[PDB]
């Protein structure tokens, strides 16, 4: 279903109220759409808050990083609301929302994560790839430590393998600020 | 009359290593070497035409060549590359021969990993170690220094039969049984 | 064949009367559409009821959970009408409608269910996945126990395997409030 | 190759005259479209008859059941016209039309049918599936017995395997009320 | 290469002059489009002739039968013009045009045919399928005998295998009334 | 990528000047489009010439035959212009243009051809197919003999295998009336 | 999920503010779009700066070279902003921005690279391909040496294998002029 | 003359375990071991070059090595990993040899499940138990404590031939038959 | 010398059942058992490493074990599951051994049907009967009651070697030939 | 010593029919039966574990069993279904045995046709005739009337070992060689 | 009687090289040549029908032909192309025969590379060297100059049996054993 309403389509109509829906795996395409929407909304009114709904299993780290940097770039506060599932890059983006304005709905699943990747070719190429992803892991952990208030070692320990959390546990963890129930 | 026939094959004391180096081939060679060893202590000749393949399979054949009592002579033919070189270099320098139309190639090992950083990191450390082990093995058998081999195996290092001789891989280029 | 009657396509026209059609397997895409429709309808008029028709075999638990949380989030009462088949997440969503406003058509099939999933990798990864889905199962059972009025143990027992129900059986079980037979 | 005519496409134009074309296999998608069209037409004018053309090999039983329940739900009489082929769920829907308003064109094929399905997994799962489809078979037979005027045993006997009928045979059986040849 | 011309596309523009293009294999989709077009044109003006251009290799017998019955159903005379290839169901539809108003262009190929089908399963199922297709063959032959003026046995003999005809041969046979060369 | 110019697309705009582009393999779909365009243009103004550009490797004989019969059916003269490649049914259609109004651009390739087909099944079915395609071959040769002015035997001889021609050779042969170079 | 807001789509709306989004692998298609956008924006107002956002893993060297030459061709200054990933041809294009107007967001990854390619056929064909790609490598290194201020040998050394950089490292290297963190 | 030839193969009392450990390979090894046992009680030498594979196949070979009367000596060559290690560790410590170019790897077992929670839960309990059984087996043969093995097998634990010696996997590194 | 060699294999009176239980494997085992029976009435040892497979193939091997005159001893190794258990349980309790690293699994049978209700119904009755037949067979050989087995095989019932002993599947856990 | 070994196999006078009935299997069985017949006129035992398959292959095995001089005894094991039953029923009633864990199934034959009505019609007549031929064969060997078999084979007719005995398919259920 | 039969095969001293040249074929030929050499020093006849294939496999067969003591005679049949020519040209000119219906083809070697410039460049240098090595080998055995061969192998250079004779590839065209 891609229903329309008056010839505005439904996501376009929600965008007019400064709501961005991130509801799929994050790749370069999705990233570009989200980035453009953030850039557009800030150009229109830098004073009003933006609402970024996140229901994503994650995806490309660099793609999500484009969204992340754009969130911080725009003058407007980007509120983040986690619904359904916010995993990997999805939960990273969720934690990246403006201070005091990071929320999740009561039954949203949050999952945090060590970076995933691949390395192919000669030993030198594999080392280059390993060093690169290790660097990525370390700066991701650093940003997460900062946003949550957890010490670096705690983030590193807790993202070693898939770590699933309830909205309440995420709040406890400092990944979100509050749980939203009603309007 | 198949009496005097496979007896003749086994009397040659000759093992052929042709094609991709894998565990199956390592098993065949191991069997043949162990079989020939129990027959007598006379020298064994190995003809190698191999582009290489599985490094651990190459390691086994290399170590088995040194393990058995009989002196092993190697004859490079066509090409000898990667894991093939490791096998070739198991023989003592005096016993490393080549036929005229052979080329030689050494390079660093290759592979792949998918998963978490930790998993990738672990496998990276492992392939670096393997690169070092093989480079030292090459250096030792060849007369070159570790850093020379290390520098040369950065990319595919192709050698003509004559250059392989100069490099310390091949000892004597032969055309006839004499 | 998706007809366009005056400019509106047929689902858009029904949305103008606050009717949302959930008529497929629930995935992230479908979830996002339903969520957006709920959010939009509540923004337009928080006082008027929303009508969510459900004909779904289920799908992603987290995807359905987005719809579920949005249903409770919006101020408007979300009425649920089960037609054809409401299974797994579909029947969960059906039971999640506003109190007294959960219906099914007379021949609608309802099916309730233990969560389905997968686990791959090392023993540690499999344990992580097992613990996760067990947690999911337990909170799903808890929410169902609450919505139906059945005790937790009864929900756990009755969802162990595929449990098919008539509309009448669903009503007796507490899953729905009443059966609609005619418009009047 | 769907032609437009005056910003309507051809099916949209026919819908404006209260004609719904069911001309494909019935799945959740098709069901949702038909249901929406029925719901829309009844909202517009509950007094005027709806015309449902059926040319379908059948499909999902639950999907068709959504259409079936909606046909009975709407206040308007749903006339059914069978053309080409009305098999399985298609012929079920054909028989479900308003009394005296079930028709077929002279050379339309009608086929009636025992339910088709599948069962996979452990013995318990297979039993659950078997019991479920048997229940479905029995209520389908019951509804057909009622709509045709045939006794239950006759429907059960005659749907054991594929049963092909001419429009005339369908009429004499009680599946349809009349054969339409020319315009009124 | 589907061009528009003025908000109509090219087929829509031709439909405004009561021309229907049947230019593909006949399946349920194509049938529904043709049927809708016939129904629409007759509703607009039952007095004016409809022009059905046929360039089809045939297809589903039941699908074509929907078109056939609709052609006879509508009050308007449906003229048929064969161009390129009218084979199987295509040539059947060509012969089904209004008396004196069945034409083919000079180099159009016409091919007549015994029905094609399939049968799978147990002996009983295969027999059911065989009896069904035999019945279909016999009523098709009967309708063709009637439209051409040929005796039944002649149609049965001449459709045993693929029977290709020139427009002239089709006219001698009684399949078409005449050949159109110019717009005169 | 079909460019537009003002709700008209580029082919629609050219159709308004009575130009039809046949620029693909001929099948039932393409045939129906071309036929509809010819029928439409003649209904609009039976007095003005139609311009049919042909760049086709050929295709279905019956499909092309629909176009052929429609070309003769419409009152308007259908001019044919061969560009790039006019092979098989493409060159047949090229030769089918109105007398004195069959052209090709200087470097257009023309190829003439015996019919291609297939036959499967029992001996009887194969014979039926063989007799049918032979009949097709003979009436195609007859129409070509008529349009070119060549005797039947010459057409039959020259189409036995793929016969490639320059625009100049096509003119000498009688397939086209003249070569266009400039406007 | 590409919103159409007022009709403009989101990228069209950003283009009206002279913003071009290069957010995919560079091939002939993407190149043609970017080139057209650059050509269009310069035709509209040669005095105002263009903003090229780059989030690309690279792609075809010749395709990127079309964009590169167009960037230098247009009178307007093309500002480049790297976000997410600018690798291979992506980072080349990033460095190709107007002097003092090459930026990256704080966490953007930059990667520089030796050219990738293939060679098939006879020895002569392989030599032709090798000589060609070597020539390409050398002129790419030359242009990079020029844009960064690094000596040729340094570029050649540092692009021998995949070379990943932080935005800060890219700045100290000369690939970008500064890092934008906030809108100030 | 094939008399004195396959007699020679069988006189070596040598079994080769090269490649993926599976039930087919377990059947071959079982046959060879049972065959050699009925001939005499003289020692048997096993050369292992294996990346591992099917754990239950590895268990069978492990248990068969201990089951037969003849003393079994193992020689690690190339690599010995996972199920391969289990086989290797069937021999008494004094009898565990390695050729110089060999690496060793222990890790926790892996698998997959699809279905209902109950099904997943059941299989999870099962792989946890398997992880524990193998870890105890490794610990016992190796001299390390259960918790040490448990901690080390968390990820892929690669060991060079010398580290495998220090760890208690390999006892003696040999280059020659002693000849 | 292949005289004293395959004679040695046949002197062991040992049958290996490794891998998936299917009709091919049932044919091999049947041949071997019939062959060994005609040689002498001395005991036969069967080593089983099987995840199971085709139940009717398992039934054949089970029934053949009981059919022949020689006493059959079974040794579970690696795993014994489903149809594998049926085979294992063909031996008398005194003759059911296990190697230390073995796990055991019993469960209800599985399958699939597509078609009309009637066809599905028919196959459902059939798999219910099969479930009952196998459960009774397990109960009988094992000492457990039918209702106990029936309750336990509801899902995958995994047993460690020691639990399999307690349950009545395994009689004696052995490490050596003695 | 392979002298006294395959001699032992052939002395058993035992043929195994395990798996899908096809022309290849029919060829193997035919060869074995013809081989055993030329050796002596002593009885032959056939163990059948078959889900069925190709009916004409089943017909050949059936007819070959009756064709040869030696008396053939059949032992059903695991399952005997469709074409398998036809083979099983070739033996005289006194000679039809079953092992305890066997189930039996008879049904009407199945197939497919594509083409013209005429072609479909022709193949329909043919499968009706085949249904009749097989039903009569079953009726004759089994003691049941043609109309009883005809009614029962309408759908899949599954029989437990005991019901197969009552029905006239199986004569004696055996557990041991005696 | 298989005594006097495979003895007869080996008495012919004949090796057949038919089909694609690869490492497997190189292994077979090597075995046969080594086997024949240890039997006696009598001449060996090789019949070649080969389109070519793997150049390094061709090199091995070429070098092995020269390596063994026995004089090798070659008979070209059907076609001899690429790597096949290299093998053919291993024999001394006096010993290079052809059957009447044979064609001959020499061309430059072919291959593929994917990756970085450096990798492509390395492999390019390598194939240029190979082209040169093979061209010199052809020139030497054939009597033509290096630059003549170099010019002719630019594209596929097809030669009829008579032209191959004129060119120095074939020495004598024969129809009978004499
Ligand atoms: Na911000
Ligand atoms: Na040695
Ligand atoms: Na609510
Ligand atoms: Na109604
Ligand atoms: Na009419
Ligand atoms: Na004209
Ligand atoms: Na510029
Ligand atoms: Na031992
Ligand atoms: Na017994
Ligand atoms: Na007999
Ligand atoms: Na020589």
């Amino acid at each position: 279903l891609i229903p329309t309403v008056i010839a505005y389509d439904i996501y376009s109509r929600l965008l007019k109220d400064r709501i961005i829906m991130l509801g799929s795996a994050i790749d370069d395409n999705v990233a570009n759409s989200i980035v453009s929407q953030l850039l557009f909304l800030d150009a229109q009114d830098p004073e009003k808050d933006i609402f970024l709904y996140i229901n994503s299993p994650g995806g490309s780290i660099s793609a999500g990083m484009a969204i992340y940097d754009t969130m911080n770039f725009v003058k407007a506060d980007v509120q983040t609301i986690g619904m359904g599932m916010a995993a990997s890059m999805g939960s990273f983006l969720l934690t990246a929302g403006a201070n005091g304005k990071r929320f999740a709905l009561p039954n949203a699943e949050i999952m945090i994560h060590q970076p995933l990747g691949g390395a192919q070719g000669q030993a030198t190429e594999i080392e280059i790839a390993a060093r690169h992803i290790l660097k990525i892991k370390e700066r991701m952990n650093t940003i997460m430590a900062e946003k949550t208030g957890q010490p670096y070692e705690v983030i590193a320990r807790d993202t070693d393998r898939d770590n699933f959390m309830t909205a309440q546990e995420a709040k406890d963890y400092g990944l979100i600020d509050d749980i939203i129930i009603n309007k | 009359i198949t009496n005097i026939l496979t007896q003749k094959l086994i009397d040659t004391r000759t093992v052929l290593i042709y094609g991709e180096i894998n565990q199956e081939l390592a098993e065949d060679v191991s069997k043949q070497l162990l079989l020939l060893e129990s027959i007598s202590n006379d020298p064994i000749t190995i003809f190698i035409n191999s582009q290489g393949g599985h490094v651990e399979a190459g390691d086994t054949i290399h170590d088995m060549i040194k393990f058995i009592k009989p002196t092993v002579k190697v004859v490079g033919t066509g090409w000898v590359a990667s894991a093939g070189i490791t096998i070739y270099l198991a023989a003592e320098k005096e016993n490393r021969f080549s036929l005229p139309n052979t080329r030689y190639m050494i390079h660093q090992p290759a592979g792949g990993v998918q998963g978490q950083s930790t998993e990738i990191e672990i496998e990276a450390k492992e392939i670096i170690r393997m690169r070092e082990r093989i480079n030292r093995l090459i250096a030792e058998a060849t007369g070159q220094s570790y850093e020379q081999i290390s520098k040369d195996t950065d990319r595919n290092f192709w050698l003509s039969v004559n250059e392989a001789k100069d490099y310390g891989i091949v000892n004597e280029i032969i055309e006839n049984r004499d």
Side-chain angles (χ1 to χ4, degrees), chain A residues 113-127 129-130 133-134 137 159-162, chain B residues 107-121 123-124 127-128 131 153-156:
Chain A
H113 219 217
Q114 172 178 174
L116 298 165
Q120 275 211 349
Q122 297 184 307
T124 309
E125 273 132 65
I126 288 164
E127 187 188 343
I133 195 171
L134 216 178
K137 183 209 264 192
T159 54
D160 189 49
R161 306 206 195 243
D162 292 7
Chain B
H107 66 184
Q108 55 179 311
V113 224
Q114 283 207 146
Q116 306 184 287
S117 296
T118 297
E119 293 166 315
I120 294 163
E121 193 183 340
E123 233 62 34
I127 201 162
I128 300 303
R131 156 136 88 20
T153 60
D154 188 46
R155 303 282 186 167
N156 283 7

Side-chain angles (χ1 to χ4, degrees), chain A residues 3-106:
Chain A
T4 58
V5 67
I6 320 159
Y8 267 111
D9 78 75
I10 225 283
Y11 299 108
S12 302
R13 180 59 192 85
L14 254 48
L15 184 65
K16 205 194 162 189
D17 291 347
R18 305 178 72 77
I19 298 161
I20 304 168
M21 302 290 301
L22 171 51
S24 59
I26 302 159
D27 64 5
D28 273 7
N29 252 276
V30 170
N32 269 247
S33 185
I34 306 296
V35 163
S36 295
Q37 286 171 71
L38 286 165
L39 252 25
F40 169 73
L41 286 181
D42 199 58
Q44 264 205 339
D45 194 348
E47 294 305 309
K48 286 187 162 205
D49 283 7
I50 294 165
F51 305 93
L52 179 61
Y53 279 85
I54 300 161
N55 176 211
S56 170
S60 163
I61 286 162
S62 80
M65 230 48 201
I67 298 166
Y68 172 83
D69 275 352
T70 304
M71 280 167 70
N72 297 145
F73 171 87
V74 296
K75 184 162 189 180
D77 279 357
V78 178
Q79 307 204 10
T80 51
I81 305 95
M83 49 160 48
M85 176 62 92
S88 272
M89 213 52 209
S91 62
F92 185 87
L93 261 22
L94 177 61
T95 320
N99 294 311
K101 296 174 186 175
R102 307 169 300 165
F103 313 102
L105 294 168

Side-chain angles (χ1 to χ4, degrees), chain B residues 119-134:
Chain B
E119 293 166 315
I120 294 163
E121 193 183 340
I122 279 163
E123 233 62 34
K125 275 167 188 159
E126 210 36 44
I127 201 162
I128 300 303
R129 267 166 130 206
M130 191 194 287
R131 156 136 88 20
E132 188 179 14
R133 184 186 54 79
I134 293 161

Side-chain angles (χ1 to χ4, degrees), chain B residues 25-154:
Chain B
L25 197 264
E27 192 178 357
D28 285 9
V29 176
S30 289
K31 270 165 183 161
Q32 292 170 80
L33 291 181
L34 288 173
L35 189 261
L36 289 172
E37 183 199 28
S38 65
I39 289 173
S40 84
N41 268 211
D42 292 323
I44 294 159
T45 306
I46 297 174
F47 291 87
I48 322 172
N49 181 329
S50 180
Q51 60 276 36
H54 186 204
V55 1
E56 280 82 18
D59 287 334
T60 292
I61 300 162
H62 166 99
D63 282 352
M64 283 296 306
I65 284 160
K66 291 191 167 177
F67 182 83
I68 59 169
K69 254 149 279 124
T71 295
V72 175
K73 301 176 181 193
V74 294
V75 183
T77 177
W79 55 5
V80 183
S82 308
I85 290 286
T86 305
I87 294 162
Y88 186 87
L89 292 181
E92 299 299 319
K93 204 166 188 304
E94 318 87 75
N95 302 322
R96 303 208 292 265
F97 302 90
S98 185
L99 269 23
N101 295 284
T102 313
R103 64 193 176 120
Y104 291 79
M105 195 267 281
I106 53 174
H107 66 184
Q108 55 179 311
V113 224
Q114 283 207 146
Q116 306 184 287
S117 296
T118 297
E119 293 166 315
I120 294 163
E121 193 183 340
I122 279 163
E123 233 62 34
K125 275 167 188 159
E126 210 36 44
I127 201 162
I128 300 303
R129 267 166 130 206
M130 191 194 287
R131 156 136 88 20
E132 188 179 14
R133 184 186 54 79
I134 293 161
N135 282 346
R136 294 219 133 91
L137 188 150
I138 293 169
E140 228 278 345
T142 211
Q144 310 277 349
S145 67
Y146 168 71
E147 21 285 310
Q148 187 57 61
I149 298 306
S150 190
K151 193 202 157 178
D152 287 337
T153 60
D154 188 46

